[PDB]
Nucleic acid binder design. Structure first.
Ligand SMILES: Cc1cn([C@H]2CC[C@@H](COP(=O)(O)OP(=O)(O)OP(=O)(O)O)O2)c(=O)[nH]c1=O
Ligand SMILES: [Mg+2]
Lengths: 69, 218, 1006, 437, 57, 65, 57
DNA sequence: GAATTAAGCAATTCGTAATCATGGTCATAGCTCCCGCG
DNA sequence: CGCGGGAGCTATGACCATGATTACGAATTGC
């Protein structure tokens, strides 16, 4: 918000924020592999719903910036 | 500036290097028609049938085309008269003098203009006869005029009856101006404004206009 | 003084004289001179304001002058069309005079001479000799053509003289050159004023040795040394080439009525005059009838540009600079203009013209004896064949094998010919005068006396073959009707296209109706819709199809709607539906539907959404009166066609009525043509719109129409599609047919005016008589005013590839079940000239095979496709490897022109490369043969690219080299393409087309 | 034949052919500068020249990128040093660039479309063009429906004297600073602010172009910085009787100026987002760019109309509103005194012969469309998908046939106002019946 | 339910990131839009690996 | 097992996955701390302490000297 | 109840790792020993950061 | 020496060329871990 | 213990080759 100039640094900042969330979901995946290899019984229907809604969110945020000309 | 050998009365044709793609065909056409051509006393002498082949064609953007030489005293260069007694070059000089305002001249010459090659379609005629050697010069005239119109931008033809079919004698489209003959009745060459039309069509082709005052002989 | 007009012709000199070539009853040729004027039509105020007085001025009466300018209007306050009624004067001067605001300048001075003096160019006149002043023997001067040409007596026969000539020239190369190669033979068919038909060939004795000259003298050929020793009664005369050319000069200088050649202006007469100027310096001097001026024979080009595209040069004709009145007629140019054929060489025209069916009486080892009469072919076919066979030498059997005539006999009602032919199994064969099984250049290499006499026979066959083509095409009657109808000189009849031959009778009616058409604004061209072409509903038709075609549809439309440039009240256009509906309401209340026709058209511009043209039918238009004149001419020649007995006279009058039909369709097309003086975009657009409504109305009555209990019921009512009229609109129509007949009619195809009505019956006779009842009932109840249809044909086994492409068996209205049907191909591969003979033969063979496999009905369509594609693959591989079919089966034809948007077009480049490389030149408008020729080491090429680079122009002297071969893959791809459009099982067709030609085949969509 | 030439050749050598060729050359030299009428006249002259002579050097054009960059060059955002001499300073304004070339029309840059202008401004343009024929085009600026003549680029004559002459004809003019610098001076931003305040205009001046007396191809100068600030809302501001200008509003409260509605759509700006904006010392200029949204043009127009209000519609460069269209709007369109009845209206048009001739020249539908201020193409698209019942050239009943055109918000808004269009149409129809029938 | 609140915080933070994309994405240049597009492709391939992990187990 | 190259290779390869999972546990613990929920890590601290004791025994054992 | 069983499986895998390192550790050789030592220092740096994140509260 | 011509559109097929879908490849920006020296 | 050099990998936008689509003119014919 407010006023900004030379928006490439804000683009780099939000790319860094996406780097943080990419490492965050890689952390979730690499501890999910460990908790699945532990042998505990888990029910992930609401987890699957959360991943489906977040993937729809990712597609909605992607589709504005995919294709040029 | 190459040269070839022919079997009849010119005995050689000195030609510029721009005339190279049409020379061997001109050699065979002139060798087949020349033994019948040269029985008649031709209006230029046979040694000067091919003077305009010495001229280059890349620097030429305008072809000024007549159908034949003058019936008498043809000098091999089209619309050239050292005595300046020919009616056609007189009306050409009158039109250029009306164009440019240069009224103090002794004669005119379309050969000494940069970018203009004066051309005779049929390269000769019998003495005192007009288009009498069309029989001999038909194939040569077609070949050499398509060779000219491959190079020049604007073709200017001095005859309505002589050059009504000149879009059929050529097959590649060129800027063609079929103008009135200078010896036409009712002064349609006096009302002719074709040299301005030549210059404007050159400027439409992004070409240099012809400075028509270069042809005046002082 | 009773004369018959032969030819009209103008003086070549600056002093303009108009001449008439005329013949009296005793056979004397009489010339009448007229002072030819430049005719101008000015108003009365312009006439009295002329500061130089006119030489002659005649009052033309109070004539209305109408501004034919098409202004669109966005409202219904159309200003009245500018009609300036004034006294008009016919201004005549011997010199050309530039008059400001002089009207009616589109017409020529010669038409103004004819119509203002009341002279028909095809007329017989008793000339008042008090207006004739004798100049010299046979030539008179007429100062007053009004009262001298006042008594128009009925027609009487005259003894016309003719000179049919063909020449033969030596050539070492492919073509003769007049500077190096002599004339070998000059043949002449001399027809005198006494009717004496003399045939004689002059043989160049310079090309023969002296012992051969003496041997021909012992054989009976006459040796002459000059023109005085020349006898026209001798059949074969030996002479030098100089004496031959002076005999040619003496014959061409004679005042014949017609000197007729084939390709003779371009080659024969030009070669004669060029060789005469070369060898002795003489010129063929045509003199005026009053002998004041004398011109020399100079063949001059006349180059037609196209009127479409970039308007490049499309055709050239060659004519004789003659002023003696002889109509020097090149038959090559005439058949080029009038016919539509693969080749226009003399052998091709003779093959297409003089074809007769002939049965076999005797068979031999090397001799086949054919006879033809009125039972083998139609009446007059065998008589024409015998007339050609009188001088003929070679007869082609079944259009592929050429047979020399051994013995010839002219019967009373046909011919009897013995042919050097292999033994043939069938009983009847098509005999034609086609290609010649000689090589002329080889005969010129080993030139002896026997070769000279054989080529003299072929030359006299060509010279008389000019006469046989002259009489076959009926150029006498066509010239007479073109002089009468188009109001033109007889030499000027065929050598002009539509606009000129319109300008005569249009001038006649404009003087008759006191109407003047003038233009002020610039004519603007828009694309408008044409005739409506329905899609074919079925690919095969096992049922009979009734063919209903409007009688002169676009002329009857223009007469019905009064569609003329000056009867157009206005064009009402709308950009929006609000203004469209408001203009619709004020259109109905303003213009009454009987007096005015409001024709709804598609818009000329994208912003417009409606376009209504209003035409006043109260005063008959100039275009309807012109169309009434041309349909009167077409109706009288159709009546003469129905009264004709011989096949040649039937062909003549069918061509004559077809010519008048095309002229009427040109009265149409000139209003769609922007450069025409009769250009009316609204009228041509409204004509297509009304014709489209006529095909939709005739389809709507006929599609879904059933016959039941002798009562004819159409699907829709018989309402006029434009207004409400007094006639009955009830579709329930009483027939004259029996009660037990209960058939259904449905439209399956439409094309502009034709509607293809599929009756569920298969009987020929019953379909013909029910379709005749349909034609009568449609013309009595469905159609209105001048709209008539006629029933032409019953289409049994109608095989339709696409729109405008169909094959059928024709059962005409005068035919029956027992009458033999004729195979009509319309736009298929058999008719198209860009389709090779091998292609046409294989399409005919495989269409016969497909008809057999569909008539058997015992196997599925996929097995039919498998067997047809397997047989096709076997035939294509056998043709590719064995190469038994010659080059002649693969010669495609194309017309040479310069009307190309691209200057680097491959076709024009190919012809110009041919004209550079070869002594034979292909003129503009010439049809040349080209074939796809590739080197012989090239294998079966899968992907076909740079196809136009493989085109090679084939002429008569072209031999396919050992290193070269026919590029079979292009022809095979086109052939396989049309077969896979014929077949079902599209996936297998794609697979086979990919394994042979590497590409996806194009399939037509219904 | 030989009485009719080897081929029919026209008079290709007359003075009329020379005049046509010279006109063809003049239209070829101004192909990038002309309206579509002069492009069609050029194509007609090319077709005539190709029919007349077998070839000509110029070819037909189908689409022409209308640009005036031949007399301009690269704009530099950096400070630079001036050359000494006598200079002619001009302000460059924010609005849409138009050119009034020899084709007698107002040509839009980047589209080449001829734009409809008021008759007094058009008459002043004809007076300027007929005063001297050496001028290639008149560089015009359309901002808030104000036609100011920014520049008059002439090939032979100096542009100083034409500006006061155009100001004599009622054309709107800027102020000028014709000062001889005669020394090397660096254009700092403080000097730029001095120069902009010396232009003494409250109108938005976005760049400065200078002319040399002895040199052609004048150069435009712009100093700015590219910024990106947050957008709170998009509002409209009334600039006429019915038209409104778009103006986006920041969170802070600064008003970034928008060129047209087409500029508003093309940038694809919505609320609560950042914009590519040029920054100036006096005001704010939104940069011209194509937005990178995934939505189409129609969805952008849908969102814009849903934001600013349903009764606004896209009317050319401006938003026009929906209201009651009575006799006062018809008198405002006809530029006459206000009338309450039809009788006083037709008497008032009977008083004014120029207004009566104007009513003759253009139809009832055009008068009713221009009174309502509808766009031409959108209203034609609307009416072409409706149905009408007509009694004495009056709409007694209307109904829409195809509702696919109602997805356009402009067409739907005009369909909402179509009852007032019917009222105005019937009123103008009655005026036409009473005055001239 | 540590993973549940962890992914809920991921949803909320990525909602903030996507509305900042919606704020700035109209006026991005080509190279930075290309970079954020590669970031979104890494986003999609990482979430499809996560979906494969929660599907196959 | 000869030359101990494969043994050293697949104990270096496993340590990358181990430190990846350790940083993963750190990142998801940062996630659940920033989510705002209250958690207790007493048994986690005990596991950290005994893991630290065994890995510093590994530090004492790993040295080459 | 996912992080505690996850770190229980982690510490069991590390029990296996420490036992196999103690099995092979009769010979280690210097460069690979320095490599696993520097990997261990990076690992205990990660452990120290994790301990800071669990003691910060 | 000049001299004025000149029918329309619909529809199909075929070759050529401009345009685009699909796919292979090639620099290229991340990218992430190994090695190393202070 | 900590950060720079380097090298293998992994997508990824851009560019180019090849084949299928389609406009576009030409030829031809039906009208
Ligand atoms: C052949 C041809 C036709 N037309 C137009 C004009 C009318 C329609 C229908 O003519 P058609 O020959 O089928 O039948 P039509 O001549 O109308 O009537 P007939 O059955 O011949 O009496 O097509 C044309 O413009 N140019 C042409 O060359
Ligand atoms: Mg018909």
């Amino acid at each position: 918000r407010s006023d900004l100039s030379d928006l490439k640094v804000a683009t780099d900042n939000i790319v860094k924020d996406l780097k943080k969330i990419i490492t965050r979901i890689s952390a979730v995946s690499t501890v999910l592999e460990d908790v699945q290899a532990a042998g505990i019984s888990r029910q992930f229907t609401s987890m699957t719903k959360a991943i489906t809604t977040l993937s729809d969110l990712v597609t909605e945020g992607k589709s504005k910036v995919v294709r040029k000309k | 500036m190459n040269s070839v050998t022919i079997s009849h009365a010119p005995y050689t044709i000195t030609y510029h290097d721009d005339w190279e793609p049409v020379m061997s065909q001109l050699v065979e056409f002139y060798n087949e028609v020349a033994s019948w051509l040269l029985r008649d006393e031709t209006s230029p002498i046979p040694d000067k049938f091919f003077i305009q082949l010495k001229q280059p064609l890349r620097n030429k953007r305008v072809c000024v085309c007549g159908i034949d030489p003058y019936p008498k005293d043809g000098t091999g260069v089209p619309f050239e008269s050292p005595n300046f007694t020919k009616k056609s070059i007189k009306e050409i000089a009158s039109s250029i003098s009306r164009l440019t305002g240069v009224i103090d001249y002794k004669g005119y010459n379309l050969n000494i203009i940069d970018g203009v090659i004066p051309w005779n379609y049929y390269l000769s005629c019998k003495l005192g006869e007009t288009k009498s050697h069309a029989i001999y010069w038909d194939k040569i005239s077609k070949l050499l005029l398509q060779h000219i119109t491959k190079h020049v931008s604007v073709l200017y033809c001095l005859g309505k009856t002589d050059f009504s079919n000149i879009r059929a004698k050529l097959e590649s489209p060129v800027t063609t101006i079929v103008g009135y003959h200078p010896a036409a009745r009712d002064h349609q060459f006096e009302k002719d404004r074709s040299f301005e039309i030549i210059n404007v069509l050159l400027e439409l082709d992004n070409k240099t206009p012809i400075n028509w005052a270069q042809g005046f002989i002082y | 003084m009773d004369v018959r007009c032969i030819n009209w012709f103008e003086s070549h000199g600056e002093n303009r004289f108009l001449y008439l070539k005329s013949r009296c009853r005793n056979g004397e040729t009489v010339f009448i001179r007229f002072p030819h004027y430049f005719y101008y039509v000015v108003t009365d105020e312009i006439y009295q304001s002329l500061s130089p007085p006119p030489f002659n001025a005649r009052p033309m009466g109070k004539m209305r002058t109408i501004d034919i300018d098409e202004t669109i209007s966005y409202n219904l306050d159309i200003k009245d069309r500018k009609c300036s009624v004034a006294d008009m004067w016919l201004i005549e001067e011997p010199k050309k005079r530039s008059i400001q605001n002089a009207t009616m300048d589109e017409f020529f001075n010669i038409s103004w001479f004819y119509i203002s003096n009341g002279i028909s160019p095809d007329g017989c006149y008793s000339l008042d000799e008090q207006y004739l002043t004798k100049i010299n023997n046979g030539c008179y001067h007429c100062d007053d053509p009004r009262n001298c040409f006042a008594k128009e007596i009925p027609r009487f026969d005259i003894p016309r003289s003719y000179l049919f000539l063909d020449i033969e020239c030596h050539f070492d190369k492919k073509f003769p050159s007049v500077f190096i190669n002599p004339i070998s033979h000059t043949s002449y068919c001399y027809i005198d004023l006494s009717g004496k038909r003399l045939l004689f060939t002059l043989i160049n004795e310079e090309m023969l040795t002296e012992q051969e000259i003496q041997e021909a003298v012992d054989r009976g050929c006459l040796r002459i040394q000059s023109l005085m020793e020349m006898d026209y009664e001798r059949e074969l005369v030996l002479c030098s080439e100089i004496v031959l050319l002076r005999i040619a000069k003496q014959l061409l200088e004679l005042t014949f009525d017609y000197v007729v050649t084939f390709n003779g202006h371009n080659f024969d007469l030009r070669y004669i005059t060029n060789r005469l100027e070369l060898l002795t310096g003489e010129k063929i001097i045509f003199r005026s009838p009053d002998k004041k001026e004398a011109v020399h024979l100079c063949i001059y080009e006349r180059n037609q540009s196209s009127h479409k595209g970039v308007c490049g040069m499309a055709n050239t004709t060659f004519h004789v600079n003659n002023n003696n009145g002889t109509i020097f007629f090149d038959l090559y140019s005439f058949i080029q203009k009038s016919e539509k054929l693969d080749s226009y060489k003399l052998d091709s025209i003779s093959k297409n013209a003089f074809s007769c069916m002939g049965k076999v009486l005797n068979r031999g080892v090397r001799e086949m004896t054919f006879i033809g009469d009125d039972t083998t072919d139609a009446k007059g076919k065998a008589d024409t064949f015998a007339k050609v066979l009188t001088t003929g030498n070679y007869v082609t059997v079944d259009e592929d094998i050429i047979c020399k005539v051994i013995r010839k006999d002219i019967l009373e009602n046909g011919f009897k010919v013995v042919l050097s032919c292999p033994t043939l199994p069938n009983d009847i064969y098509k005999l034609s005068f086609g290609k010649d099984d000689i090589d002329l250049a080889q005969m010129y290499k080993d030139y002896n006396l026997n070769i000279a006499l054989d080529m003299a026979r072929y030359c006299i066959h060509d010279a008389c073959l000019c006469q046989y083509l002259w009489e076959y095409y009926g150029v006498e009657t066509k010239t007479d009707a073109g002089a009468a109808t188009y109001v033109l000189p007889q030499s000027m009849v065929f050598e002009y296209r539509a606009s000129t031959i319109i300008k005569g009778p249009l001038l006649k009616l404009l003087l008759e109706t006191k109407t003047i058409l003038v233009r002020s604004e610039t004519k603007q061209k828009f694309p408008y819709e044409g005739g409506k072409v329905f899609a074919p509903k079925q690919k095969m038709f096992s049922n009979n199809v009734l063919i209903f075609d409007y009688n002169s549809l676009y002329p009857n439309v223009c007469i019905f709607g009064n569609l003329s440039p000056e009867t157009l009240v206005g064009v009402v256009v709308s950009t929006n539906r609000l203004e469209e509906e408001i203009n619709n309401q004020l259109l109905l209340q303003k213009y009454p539907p009987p007096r005015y026709i409001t024709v709804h058209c598609e818009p000329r511009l994208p912003n417009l959404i409606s376009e209504i043209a209003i035409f006043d039918r109260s005063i008959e238009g100039t275009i309807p009166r012109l169309l009434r004149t041309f349909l009167a001419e077409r109706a009288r020649y159709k009546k003469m066609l129905k009264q004709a007995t011989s096949s040649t006279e039937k062909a003549i009058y069918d061509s004559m009525q077809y010519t008048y039909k095309i002229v009427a369709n040109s009265v149409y097309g000139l209003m769609g043509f922007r450069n025409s003086a009769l250009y009316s975009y609204a009228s041509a657009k409204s004509c297509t719109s009304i014709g489209r409504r006529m095909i939709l109305y005739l389809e709507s009555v006929l599609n879904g129409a059933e016959l039941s209990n002798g009562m004819l019921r159409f699907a829709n009512t018989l309402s006029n599609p434009f207004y409400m009229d007094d006639r009955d609109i009830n579709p329930i129509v009483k027939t004259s047919l029996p009660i037990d007949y209960r058939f259904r009619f449905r439209s399956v195809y439409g094309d502009t005016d034709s509607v293809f009505t599929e009756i569920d019956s298969q009987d020929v006779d019953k379909s013909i008589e029910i379709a005749k009842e349909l034609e009568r009932l449609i013309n009595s109840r469905v159609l209105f005013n001048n709209f008539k249809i006629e029933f032409e044909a019953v289409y049994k086994n109608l095989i339709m590839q696409s729109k405008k492409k169909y094959t059928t068996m024709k059962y005409s209205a005068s035919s029956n079940s027992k009458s033999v049907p004729e195979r009509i191909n319309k736009g298929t591969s058999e008719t198209r000239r860009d389709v090779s003979k091998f292609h046409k033969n294989m399409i005919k063979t495989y269409k016969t095979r497909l008809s057999e496999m569909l008539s058997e009905g015992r196997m599925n369509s996929n097995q039919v496709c498998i067997d047809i594609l397997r047989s096709l693959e076997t035939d294509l591989r056998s043709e590719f490897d064995s190469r038994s079919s010659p080059l002649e089966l693969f010669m495609l034809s194309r017309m040479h022109h310069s009307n190309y948007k691209s200057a680097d077009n491959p076709n024009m480049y190919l012809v110009t490369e041919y004209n550079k490389n070869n002594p034979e030149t292909i003129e503009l408008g010439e049809r040349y043969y080209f074939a796809y020729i590739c080197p012989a080491n090239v294998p079966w090429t899968k992907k076909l690219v740079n196809i136009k680079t493989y085109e090679t122009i084939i002429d008569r002297s072209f031999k396919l080299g050992s290193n070269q071969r026919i590029f079979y893959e292009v022809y095979f791809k086109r052939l396989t393409s049309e077969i896979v459009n014929l077949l079902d099982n599209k996936v297998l067709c794609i697979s086979f087309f990919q394994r042979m030609f590497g590409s996806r085949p194009t399939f037509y969509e219904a | 034949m030989h009485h009719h030439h080897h081929h029919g050749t026209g008079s290709m050598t007359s003075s009329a052919d020379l005049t046509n060729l010279k006109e063809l050359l003049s239209l070829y030299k101004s192909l990038r500068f002309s309206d579509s009428v002069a492009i069609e006249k050029y194509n007609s002259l090319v077709e005539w020249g190709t029919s007349t002579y077998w070839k000509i050097g110029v070819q037909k054009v189908t689409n022409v990128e209308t640009s005036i960059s031949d007399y301009y060059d690269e704009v530099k955002n950096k400070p630079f040093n001036i050359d000494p001499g006598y200079y002619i300073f001009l302000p460059v304004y924010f609005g849409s660039v138009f050119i009034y070339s020899k084709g007698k029309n107002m040509v839009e840059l980047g589209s080449g479309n001829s734009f409809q202008i008021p008759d007094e401004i058009r008459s002043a343009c004809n007076k300027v063009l007929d005063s001297d024929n050496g001028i290639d085009f008149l560089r015009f600026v359309l901002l808030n429906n104000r036609w100011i003549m920014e520049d008059a680029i002439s090939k032979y004559q100096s542009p100083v004297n034409i500006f006061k002459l155009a100001s004599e004809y009622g054309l709107n003019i800027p102020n000028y600073l014709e000062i001889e610098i005669e020394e090397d001076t660096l254009f700092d931003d403080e000097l730029y602010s001095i120069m902009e305040r010396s232009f003494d205009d409250t109108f938005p001046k976005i760049s400065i172009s200078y002319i040399k007396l002895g040199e052609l191809k004048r150069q435009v100068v712009d100093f700015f910085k590219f910024s990106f600030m947050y957008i709170e809302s998009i509002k409209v501001d009334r600039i006429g009787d019915n038209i409104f200008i778009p103006s986006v509003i920041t969170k802070s409260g600064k008003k970034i100026l928008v060129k047209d509605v087409d500029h508003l759509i093309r940038s694809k700006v919505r609320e609560h987002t950042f914009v590519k904006v040029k920054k100036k010392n006096t005001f704010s200029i939104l940069y011209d760019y194509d937005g990178n949204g995934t939505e189409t043009r129609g969805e952008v127009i849908k969102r814009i109309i849903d934001t600013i209000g349903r009764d606004y519609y896209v009317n050319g460069k401006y938003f026009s509103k929906v209201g009651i269209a009575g006799l006062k709007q018809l008198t405002n369109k006809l530029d006459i005194n206000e009338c309450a009845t039809v009788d006083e209206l037709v008497d008032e048009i009977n008083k004014s012969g120029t207004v009566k001739r104007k009513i003759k020249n253009q139809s009832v539908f055009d008068l009713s469309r221009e009174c309502l201020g509808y766009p031409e193409a959108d209203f034609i698209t609307l009416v072409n998908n409706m149905r009408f019942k007509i009694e004495n050239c009056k709409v007694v009943n209307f109904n829409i046939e195809n509702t696919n055109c109602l997805n356009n918000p402009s067409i739907e808004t005009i369909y909402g106002n179509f009852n007032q269009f019917v009222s105005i149409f019937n009123t103008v129809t009655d005026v036409k019946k009473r005055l001239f029938e």
